[PDB]
From a paper:
At the other end is the “base” region formed by the three domains I that contain the fusion peptides, and the three domains V. Based on this domain organization, gB was assigned to the family of class III fusion proteins; other members include glycoprotein G from vesicular stomatitis virus (VSV G) and the baculovirus major envelope glycoprotein gp64 (Backovic and Jardetzky, 2009; Heldwein et al., 2006; Kadlec et al., 2008; Roche et al., 2006).
To this end, we determined the structure of gB bound to liposomes with cryo-ET subtomogram averaging. Ectodomain trimers of gB lacking the MPR interacted efficiently with liposomes and formed a coat-like layer. This pH was chosen because the FLs in the low pH crystal structure seemed more exposed and thus possibly in a conformation more relevant for membrane insertion. In the final refinement stage, gB trimers were allowed to tilt relative to the membrane, resulting in an improvement in resolution to 2.7 nm. No density connecting the two leaflets of the lipid bilayer was observed consistent with the interaction being limited to the outer leaflet. Fitting of these elements resulted in the three domains I moving closer to the membrane, separating from each other and orienting the FLs toward the tripod legs. It is clear from this fitting that the binding of gB to the membrane is mediated by the interaction of the FLs region with the outer leaflet of the membrane (cf. protein-lipid interface shown in Figure 4L).
Author numbering:
A (entry chain C), B (entry chain A), C (entry chain B): 103 to 476, 492 to 724
Amino acid sequence: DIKAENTDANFYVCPPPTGATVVQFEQPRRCPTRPEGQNYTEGIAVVFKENIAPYKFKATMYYKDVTVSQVWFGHRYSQFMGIFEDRAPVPFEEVIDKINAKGVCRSTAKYVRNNLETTAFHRDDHETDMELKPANAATRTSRGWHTTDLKYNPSRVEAFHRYGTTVNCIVEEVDARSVYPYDEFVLATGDFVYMSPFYGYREGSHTEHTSYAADRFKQVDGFYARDLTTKARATAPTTRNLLTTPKFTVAWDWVPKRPSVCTMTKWQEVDEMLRSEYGGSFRFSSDAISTTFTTNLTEYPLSRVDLGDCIGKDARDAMDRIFARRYNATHIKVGQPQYYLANGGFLIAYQPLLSNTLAELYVREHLREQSRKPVERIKTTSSIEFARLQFTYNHIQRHVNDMLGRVAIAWCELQNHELTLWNEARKLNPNAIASVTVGRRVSARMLGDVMAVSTCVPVAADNVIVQNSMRISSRPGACYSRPLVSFRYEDQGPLVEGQLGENNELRLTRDAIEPCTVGHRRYFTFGGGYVYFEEYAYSHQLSRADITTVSTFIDLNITMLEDHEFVPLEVYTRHEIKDSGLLDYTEVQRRNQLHDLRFADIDTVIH
Amino acid sequence: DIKAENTDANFYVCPPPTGATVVQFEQPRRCPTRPEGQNYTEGIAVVFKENIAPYKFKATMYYKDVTVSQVWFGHRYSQFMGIFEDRAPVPFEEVIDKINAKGVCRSTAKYVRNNLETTAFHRDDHETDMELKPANAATRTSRGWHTTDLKYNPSRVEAFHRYGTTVNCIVEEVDARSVYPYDEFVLATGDFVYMSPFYGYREGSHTEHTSYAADRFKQVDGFYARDLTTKARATAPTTRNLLTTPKFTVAWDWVPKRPSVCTMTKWQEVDEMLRSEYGGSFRFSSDAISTTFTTNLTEYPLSRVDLGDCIGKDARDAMDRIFARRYNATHIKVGQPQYYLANGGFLIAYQPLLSNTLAELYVREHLREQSRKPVERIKTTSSIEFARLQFTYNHIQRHVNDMLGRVAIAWCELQNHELTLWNEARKLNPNAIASVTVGRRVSARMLGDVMAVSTCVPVAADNVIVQNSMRISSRPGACYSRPLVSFRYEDQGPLVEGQLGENNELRLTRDAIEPCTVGHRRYFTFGGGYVYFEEYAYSHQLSRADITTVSTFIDLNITMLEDHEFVPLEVYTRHEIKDSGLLDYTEVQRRNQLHDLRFADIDTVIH
Amino acid sequence: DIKAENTDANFYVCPPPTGATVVQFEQPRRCPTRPEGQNYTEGIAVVFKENIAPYKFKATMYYKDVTVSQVWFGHRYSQFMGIFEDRAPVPFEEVIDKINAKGVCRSTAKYVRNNLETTAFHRDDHETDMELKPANAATRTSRGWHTTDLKYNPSRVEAFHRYGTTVNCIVEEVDARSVYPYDEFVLATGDFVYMSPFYGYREGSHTEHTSYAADRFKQVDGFYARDLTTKARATAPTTRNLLTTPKFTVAWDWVPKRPSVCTMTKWQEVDEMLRSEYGGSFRFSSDAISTTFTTNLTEYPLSRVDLGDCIGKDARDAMDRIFARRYNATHIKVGQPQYYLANGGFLIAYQPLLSNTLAELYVREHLREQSRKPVERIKTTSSIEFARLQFTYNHIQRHVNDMLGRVAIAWCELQNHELTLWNEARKLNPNAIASVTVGRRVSARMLGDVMAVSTCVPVAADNVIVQNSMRISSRPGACYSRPLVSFRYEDQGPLVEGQLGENNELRLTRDAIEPCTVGHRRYFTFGGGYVYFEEYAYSHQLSRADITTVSTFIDLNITMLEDHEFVPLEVYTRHEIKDSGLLDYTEVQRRNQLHDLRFADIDTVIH
């Protein structure tokens, strides 16, 4: 007769439970604990990296240009038979006496060449004084001075061969380099000198190239140079080396070798560096830098380091400086500065810091720090980046776990408390609770604390019918609150008496009756929709859609983090760098090699 | 007699609460709000980086090889007294007239040398000027041409000296380079020329120190060159500079200095660049690039930039181009392009974009953009990476906070609503609720809205006993639903009457009785396990394990993100790159450096 | 009379609901599912990068120094008329016979020069054999040997010109480098040679032409060199090329061209490399490396690669090696090694791995792998970093989504179950539940399953009054549990009878009465605070603050991840690299280029 409007829903019948099945609720679970916090030491660190260093210094050169020329005189014309050009060293004596003090130089050159002592006279004059003047201007040049502008050719005699001599004294300032602190350091030309800026009265290597009298090398102590141009005199003395090579004499100031070089560089200063002890290793993270470094716990011998006085020198300087500014009132130092080597070959100097508040701790901390305290070069990697990645990675990870962990605990605790609610709740409606718990529809009743359960049998939607009239003829004055129904499990046959219950439960028995009333209008969950009864009478059927909905649940909107691709990005390619400067190794090289071909002709061979 | 099987659990007794303690539930808490969303402007940006680079151009050289040789004739043999080789400039006139137009060149050279005008006649014959032909093939060479293959020497006359002269005209192409305008640009030799292609009356440069003799430099306007090889004539005129140096004459095309030079490079184009305003700074993020840039709000003066016309030129080009493709229908431009300088020294040009939909906004946006609008070089860092890190970091952070924040709100709201459930729940069972809330077992009853509470006293597990028979002799026909028990607080003494309650509560009074029934089987929470009663009679005891469990709680499985280590990774070690820069190392490096020493003559002196 | 102490709270009245409004609870929502896990293949990979490579090789040079000098004898003194210096090739025959086998050289030189065959004799007397002896020491040399220490000038005769000739045999290892795979290569001396080891003698190269007579170039097969110094004989033969240039003869060992040069380098080995198939691309992630690579699915032709035999050679070597150590028992290989090209131009060789457990799978996997299997150089980027970023980014993202996703499901499930609790709960107190659900105060009653609702009307705090005495005169022996009140909606007028209800509900009707009792003390929610009644009598009023609070809610503390800034950080910067060097490249170049300017002598031109 009246069949459910809405097919979609299902129906169940639930026989009363018996002994046979019983179950218990789980008791509250133990909760996770938040991890002990990591402890961070405060401190100041400076970082050092490996360095080049070249050797660079200044020098002066004194040499003279000796030229002799031959001329043949033709009737109309003249021709050069040949021109001879030499360089002559200026003597130690001449340099000091003539050039340096006076600034005046001598025209004539007297030097050994080819195991012969040759002499030249300028402009075959009487020996005369010459006054040096600065060299003609050129861009990007060092200073230089020269006596003689002009060349001297023999006076004209017809049909004769003649020789003429010129001398030009030259002095120049030199930039000197030593690729390897060694026998040789180089001149502007790249003309080599076998001498060293370092030496130096005393050295082990003193032996190395000396089986000697003085002879060539001479040192003046307490040398005061005077500027040629200014003719100012040096305020302070130096030790002046002069080496006389056959071509020329060079002079420079002597300085002790060791302090000159030294290798290591002080990359950066971190006001706040944190040291962490994890994993049997140390972490130093610079917040600003956003780098983290990993080091062994043990400290790194400075003594091991070669040439590297500087490191201590710098380290204290920065540390002292930093402490005063930021630290001074605020914090107290613990222990003395410490050095660690970190992957990437960065050397870290650390100065642990203690807060004033903490200060009582100071004794204990000091002891620990001290225990840490215990020639090769250190190689450094070009790329920081890994440290930065480490820095970034850890921090983010730090947050994620921390926040998530809290949630988990919150979740767990929430569940435990909730159980209390559920316990009572099941009491009110064992079926509803039982069904949800099991996850299937079931019938249950409480036996004592424990709850019995039995499963329910589905009934076809098709086979359900609702009775038209709630009210009871037999015993008037009473009306049953809920509808009655008929149904059967299988299609073919029998019809079963029964009545409706909450959530489409067909209860076999029709116990529950209430006093009749007026204005008695109700809705019942029937099938997909609701069945509508009015005045204990059948009305129409509805669907859920008709009725406005409200939601128990609290919404959460969670979205994924979408994927991203990182494409190779570089300011510079390898090629670009090579191209960059200067300009090209390749371009230059191609040009240079070519040079002989274009300019000079080897080629011609003839039978 | 009947003692609990399962020790593990505890027992409590809970006396009824009095006035003395009362507590209230907390009221719902205020919830966090989701942050206002960040606003992002759309736009198109191009990025620029610093670049040096130096200047190159083509040039041609005309010079002649003048050689004179001496021979002595021995009886059998001949020997060279000596060979003289010179270069002679080819005259301006000769170049234009002879070489250029005709392509023919002449044997004879006439130039000043050593303040003398010397002349040479090639292969001393009454003069001929044959022609030029291309130079012999070489790899990686520029073009060149030369009149004379062979060298000429005097005919043999015995026991006499003779002189012979040769002339070979040479013309060559080849590249020229000028780093920057000053003073000289370089020719192949490593010799220099100082002329400037660059200037230019309309330039400062003329001022720079000048000799100057008029003659040497000459400019031809409306020059049409003809290719020597092809003998094609140039379609279009150029301005041809020729400079005659004593060695040679060089010619090239004059070009205005400025447009050639200039600097900064257009690194990349971003179709979609987002500008964000945070922190009193700007963020530009390129999604594809995955870089973010930080800039000051204020714009960066282009005028400040030195040599840098290009930037505008490029910027518009890209922007216009980009807009049409992607943007054209879709979006409308706002304002004119804007430039910002970002850390890392990247210059960003930005063109703000507006959507069509938004367009009404357009007036307002325009005003804001405009307000932004307000010689040095800009230095750029090699490494992008920090920006990328920033890009990566922010995005991830963005997600994490966003998602988490939502959860927190959801959590909060959930709690508030839950309170409603709890309020009723406590009503049903004040003890259970009260206990959980307090976190200890307590007894409570409701006085009005407020709930009173009192604490409970633990009872020893050992001292508890259960009565065998539920049923009551005295008043038959009634049976007590729950078991009765005896217990005492302390070991030694007295026994107390009492009965069981939920969760091992020993209630002093034994009120609650129900009608007797059959099939009355129940479980009670007793100690660790359950006590089993059948038919109002004692049966056996059980443990919890025996009974299958169901769980209220909804599981969550949360796992930590495990630590990771980043080890230094590099494609290239520094050395390898240097190795790449040709070429490598040690033995050669040893050899080369030495060169001056050995070749310069140490060996000895003869007095 | 008695008005609320605490203003802050509001009051409501709730008329009974009617038909007019009804609502339903939402049914449980479908839950999200956890994504299918990604599948990862295990495998071993090696990575390769692009390489430079240069050519370098050893050489030997044999040449002689031929010098002739002229002297004029002055009365006292002597002078050099001139000195002639030449280099003479040492003959093929001489080298093999004399120098190589004997280690002896000859005084005389005989070579063609200037199309004349000149000869020189040393010491002019006539021949005696000369043993070679090592050259004088210099630091950083290659080896060399020379017969003759000293130079010769003719015996003195007065007023005569005389000639003297000197010959010094010289041999030197020298280093050789060649830019190009074909002929041209250069000495350490830097003189160019046109020859080359490079070509495998049978090669394409034969066609490539330099054409000459046979004599100059000769090859010896089965050459055994003997060390000059040691005078050891070579154990094993080589093929010895000798080229005789006019200046000198050079010899080196011939080797096949191709294998020498070749390309790509084997960057790294990854024990565990994971391949992932996503996005129509492959991901290889190295855990240790913390890089991820993206590749096309298809494999990359090795054959395409130019010079690159090595790759296979290395790849197998590592793979075989790796497998045994880690893999050997543990895993089984699938298929043969495979190669992919990844962005960044890294070539990846992959060897898929299968576990033993899985092994049944083996057939299927093999088929898939095989299907993948299908002259240019590959360019590689300097910077890994993007891959690392990708690696980092993905992993973190992986965690975040995974964990969060779980939470969402947990949340959803939790809500559904909770609904069960709510359903019953509303039953107990429809108003409280209804109000919360709606979010405003409302009145509701249950009609059947569905709940009716109506809204409530706020009442002024001001207009509420409480009745002093609970107890009822009329019917003594009964006392009303809750207080009675009077109120009115608006200020001016009427007073309404009513009574208190939970949460400041003023119920119009005063139904609910309980038996009178003693010790009847209660609290009622009144206004902000509580009203206190004792013994069914009015006492005083309180505030909430007075009473201690307990909280239902489970706390969560969630904090944001704070922003971070990454500042540009570079251990290595472009300038520093360029500088890095001794003295330094930039400084070199500026100085070097300058050289002509300062040194060169125009100096000036005059008539």
